[PDB]
């Protein structure tokens, strides 16, 4: 019912400067994921990196404590154009 | 500018159009045709068109393509009415049932007789659905061939190879929905969200008009080598597996990028296509723009006239 890919995204561990995110395994092969993050509402350009399509986790580092971040995961697949999934978190 | 209509014919085709409305394709207008009036009303599928009221009193086609074709012949006028005005029509159907296999050829022949560029995008059933359904789908595709400009078939059996381990029956069918959508989108976005190398609709016509059988595949890549890697992934797609690309009478290529597309990248994709492409071949390569894209690229390749 979620319709995005991935369908679920959660922070599975958190430190003052780092976040470990998890997502669900996809029904259709994914070439790579595109992960972006940045301070919610901030003026500074969002950061981003890619992980290979066979991963279901990623580590975001270099963050600062007590800041609310917006984290978005795009799944890039030859077999669909599904929307990304997004969550918020404060370090 | 050119007006694009997308018509889901039958239960599978309606499931495809429902997914396309929800997920959104920019700039196309959606319709569903069906014999089953109750299924027509269940969800948001754009404008609905019931066919075969006389024969099948809204109760369906009974999985028989003869009844779905008979139902289609009753109100040719209804279809001509809603198709009128378009320049291009995509007809989406799962072949191998009753409505899709029988009514899609008729919907296609009406669209043709209005001078519309008629593109069928249809699936062939999974092997586990049985030999009868597959045989039905073959005759409906052969019948569909007589009255289309281009007929892209998506054999669902080839999707099984990319499906996740232990997937549900439902998710497997939903994955075939996404491929039909990605297929209509990858072609229509050349018109609805052009980039710098905007394809003229008259060139789309040249490469798809009165062409016959077609196949498409796609790739996606990011990083320094995004152009060559996306292009090679597309030509290596499992839906183009059995097609010798040098035998296609036409190739239509859609490079989806943001604002950062470099000259040597457009050269690179085209060099890749033109190396395999025959010389009596219409070759049409344009860009489409996706703004929420950064250092990445999608390449869609439609091989037309392979029959
Ligand atoms: N994309 C997609 N294909 C389907 C779905 N359900 C069935 N199909 C395929 O479409 C073929 C035709 O079935 P269907 O369209 O439901 O029969 P019809 O209602 O008489 O047109 C089936 O044999 C399936 O392989 C669906 O929900 N989505």
Numbering used by the authors:
A (entry chain B): 0 to 90
B (entry chain A): 10 to 316
Reproduce, without paraphrasing, sentences from the article in which this PDB structure was first reported:
FtsZ is a tubulin homolog GTPase protein that is widely conserved in bacteria and plays a key role in a complex called divisome, which carries out cell division. FtsZ polymerizes into protofilaments to form the Z-ring that acts as a scaffold for accessory proteins during cell division. FtsZ treadmilling, a motion in which the protofilament polymerizes in one end (plus-end) and depolymerizes in the other end (minus-end), drives cell wall synthesis that constricts the Z-ring to form a septum of the cell. In order to aid high-resolution structure determination of the FtsZ protofilament, we developed a monobody (Mb) that binds to both KpFtsZ and EcFtsZ with high affinity.
The structures of the two crystal forms (P212121 and P21) of the KpFtsZtr–Mb and EcFtsZtr–Mb complexes were determined using molecular replacement with the KpFtsZtr crystal structure (Protein Data Bank (PDB) code: 6LL528) as the reference, at resolutions of 2.20 and 2.50 (KpFtsZtr–Mb) and 1.84 and 2.60 Å (EcFtsZtr–Mb), respectively. FtsZ in the P212121 and P21 crystals of the KpFtsZtr–Mb and EcFtsZtr–Mb complexes all showed the R conformation, and the crystals contained one and three complex molecules per asymmetric unit, respectively. The P212121 crystal structures of KpFtsZtr–Mb showed straight protofilaments in the crystal. The molecular architecture of the protofilaments was very similar to that of KpFtsZ (PDB code:6LL528), although the relative orientation of the molecules is slightly different. In the KpFtsZtr–Mb complex, the Mb interacted with the central helix (H7 helix), the H6-H7 loop, and a β-sheet in the CTD. The interaction between FtsZ and the Mb was mainly mediated by Arg residues in the FG loop of the Mb. The binding region of Mb was distant from the GTP-binding site of FtsZ, which is consistent with the finding that the GTPase activity of KpFtsZ was not mostly affected by Mb binding. In contrast, the monomeric structures of Mb-bound KpFtsZtr and Mb-free KpFtsZtr (PDB code:6LL528) showed a relatively large difference (r.m.s.d. of 1.005 Å for 272 Cα atoms for the P212121 dataset and 1.085 Å for 285 Cα atoms for the P21 dataset). The differences between these structures were observed mainly in the T3 loop and KpFtsZtr–Mb interface region.
